[PDB]
Design an enzyme around this catalytic site. Structure first.
Site, short mmCIF file in Angstrom:
data_model
loop_
_atom_site.label_atom_id
_atom_site.label_comp_id
_atom_site.label_asym_id
_atom_site.label_seq_id
_atom_site.Cartn_x
_atom_site.Cartn_y
_atom_site.Cartn_z
N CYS A 15 -3.72 51.37 75.14
CA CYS A 15 -2.71 52.03 75.53
C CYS A 15 -2.75 53.37 76.21
CB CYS A 15 -1.51 52.01 74.23
SG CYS A 15 0.21 52.22 75.00
N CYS A 19 2.75 56.33 70.52
CA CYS A 19 3.95 56.07 69.52
C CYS A 19 3.49 55.95 68.10
CB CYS A 19 4.59 54.79 69.89
SG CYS A 19 5.14 54.26 71.57
N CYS A 22 3.29 52.53 65.94
CA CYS A 22 2.78 51.50 66.89
C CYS A 22 1.95 50.49 65.77
CB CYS A 22 1.61 51.94 67.78
SG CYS A 22 0.97 50.54 68.80
N1 LIG Z 1 6.05 49.48 64.13
C1 LIG Z 1 6.67 48.77 65.05
N2 LIG Z 1 7.89 47.91 64.53
C2 LIG Z 1 8.63 47.43 65.33
N3 LIG Z 1 8.50 47.13 66.56
C3 LIG Z 1 7.32 47.75 66.98
C4 LIG Z 1 6.79 48.58 66.52
N4 LIG Z 1 5.55 49.07 67.15
C5 LIG Z 1 5.83 48.58 68.36
N5 LIG Z 1 6.98 47.89 68.38
C6 LIG Z 1 7.42 47.21 69.46
O1 LIG Z 1 6.78 46.15 69.71
C7 LIG Z 1 6.88 45.58 71.18
C8 LIG Z 1 5.45 45.38 71.76
S1 LIG Z 1 4.14 46.85 71.78
C9 LIG Z 1 3.36 46.62 73.15
C10 LIG Z 1 3.90 46.61 74.37
C11 LIG Z 1 4.31 47.76 75.24
N6 LIG Z 1 3.01 48.81 74.97
C12 LIG Z 1 5.30 48.36 74.66
O2 LIG Z 1 5.56 49.56 73.97
O3 LIG Z 1 6.53 47.72 75.07
C13 LIG Z 1 7.49 47.19 71.95
O4 LIG Z 1 8.98 46.69 72.25
C14 LIG Z 1 7.28 48.11 70.61
O5 LIG Z 1 8.16 49.18 70.91
S1 SF4 Z 2 4.38 50.81 70.92
FE1 SF4 Z 2 1.93 50.98 70.57
S2 SF4 Z 2 1.16 49.64 72.51
FE2 SF4 Z 2 3.53 49.97 73.00
S3 SF4 Z 2 3.45 52.24 74.21
FE3 SF4 Z 2 3.79 52.60 72.09
S4 SF4 Z 2 1.63 53.15 71.20
FE4 SF4 Z 2 1.40 51.73 73.24
#
Ligand SMILES: Nc1ncnc2c1ncn2[C@@H]1O[C@H](CSCC[C@H](N)C(=O)O)[C@@H](O)[C@H]1O
Ligand code: SF4
Ligand SMILES: Nc1ccn([C@@H]2O[C@H](COP(=O)(O)OP(=O)(O)OP(=O)(O)O)[C@@H](O)[C@H]2O)c(=O)n1
Ligand SMILES: [Cl-]
Ligand SMILES: [Cl-]
Length: 291
Positions: A15, A19, A22
């Site tokens: 990535c 976040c 994540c």
């Molecule tokens: N700890 C968490 N709890 C709930 N949703 C989460 C999470 N971490 C990531 N997500 C959500 O899971 C989904 C896939 S994450 C991977 C796709 C992309 N990088 C993105 O961020 O959209 C995204 O909508 C993200 O915001």
């Molecule tokens: S949620 Fe995780 S995988 Fe999606 S943009 Fe954020 S750091 Fe990247």
């Protein structure tokens, strides 16, 4: 007994964002060769696949977006899948990609946790170089121009739990707005062997419900508390192993490419009843929608 009707394929763990909560972190740099991903997708189709969602990681990273585009076209045109979708942070999506691949994509979901720049900085969604609200509107208007259904996903966490997003969401007119309670996953965002630490982002169920009630006017809202989200997806990792979340981790099966779909999916931990309860089956082909 589990038919893989709607499956997420997290083909990369790379990535470009940071976040803090994540739950699908940069644990490997493995990505299948395109031909092997296609072989796995064909196996899924033969086993009953109807919807594929490409995820990660940031799916647009691989081969400058062309890997994702080729898989999108393969699924729509060669497999004839009813629904091909993506979840993306939106940072790398260019109009050229819509020109080359947009015809084949049913739904583009962009993750947007806040319309406030300071909150996105606290979260780690980019470095604030782009005008975030404008970039989201630009992608939304390209979805209009190129006839792709537009979707938004939001993670409700400590830093946006009080936010009022009603006007901002309605201004984007999405077909679907998924509202996730921030979820803890050991080995991803919790514990000693994790690249992230999501504990400080978590909210109570009561706080999550308060956010839902504030946004009742948004017709497209689809809510997913921790209990609705954790085990209600079929999740393939970058090796095309199913990830089982029933133990609080992402525990991988053997790869469908090695043992087949039917053997691997027995270890998925999928809760089909919850998949249906959270609204996982819906009108998901853009040809059947009114854009
Ligand atoms: N700890 C968490 N709890 C709930 N949703 C989460 C999470 N971490 C990531 N997500 C959500 O899971 C989904 C896939 S994450 C991977 C796709 C992309 N990088 C993105 O961020 O959209 C995204 O909508 C993200 O915001
Ligand atoms: S949620 Fe995780 S995988 Fe999606 S943009 Fe954020 S750091 Fe990247
Ligand atoms: N324990 C979980 C549960 C979900 N996810 C991932 O979180 C993302 C949720 O995005 P969402 O838009 O809900 O996925 P779709 O399958 O496209 O949803 P729908 O078909 O209901 O629109 C998916 O990539 C899913 O695999 C995850 O990594 N770990
Ligand atoms: Cl078929
Ligand atoms: Cl809920």
């Amino acid at each position: 007994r589990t038919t893989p009707v709607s499956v997420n394929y997290h083909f990369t763990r790379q990535c470009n964002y940071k976040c803090g909560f994540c739950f699908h972190t940069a644990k490997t740099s493995f990505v299948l060769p395109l031909e092997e991903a296609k072989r796995g997708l064909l196996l899924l189709k033969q086993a009953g696949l109807e919807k594929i969602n490409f995820s990660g990681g940031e799916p647009f990273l691989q081969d400058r977006g062309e890997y994702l585009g080729k898989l999108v076209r393969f699924c729509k045109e060669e497999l004839a899948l009813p629904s091909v979708s993506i979840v993306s942070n939106g940072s790398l999506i260019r109009e050229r990609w819509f020109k080359d691949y947009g015809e084949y994509l049913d739904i583009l979901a962009i993750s947007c946790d806040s319309f406030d720049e300071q909150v996105n900085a606290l979260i780690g969604r980019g470095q604030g170089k782009k005008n975030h609200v404008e970039n989201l509107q630009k992608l939304r208007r390209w979805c209009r121009d190129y006839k792709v259904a537009f979707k938004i996903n939001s993670v409700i966490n400590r830093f946006n739990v009080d936010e009022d997003m009603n006007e901002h969401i309605k201004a984007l007119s999405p077909v679907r707005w998924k509202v996730f309670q921030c979820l803890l996953i050991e080995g991803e965002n919790s514990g000693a062997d994790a690249l992230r630490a999501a504990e400080r982002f978590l909210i109570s169920n009561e706080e999550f419900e308060t956010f839902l009630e504030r946004h009742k006017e948004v017709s497209c809202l689809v809510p997913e508390s921790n209990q609705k989200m954790k085990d209600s997806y079929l999740i393939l990792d970058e090796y095309m192993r199913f990830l089982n979340c029933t133990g609080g981790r992402k525990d991988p099966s053997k790869s469908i490419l090695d043992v087949g779909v039917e053997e691997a999916i027995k270890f998925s931990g999928f809760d089909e009843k919850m998949f249906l309860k959270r609204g996982g089956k819906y009108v998901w082909s853009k040809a059947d929608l009114k854009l």
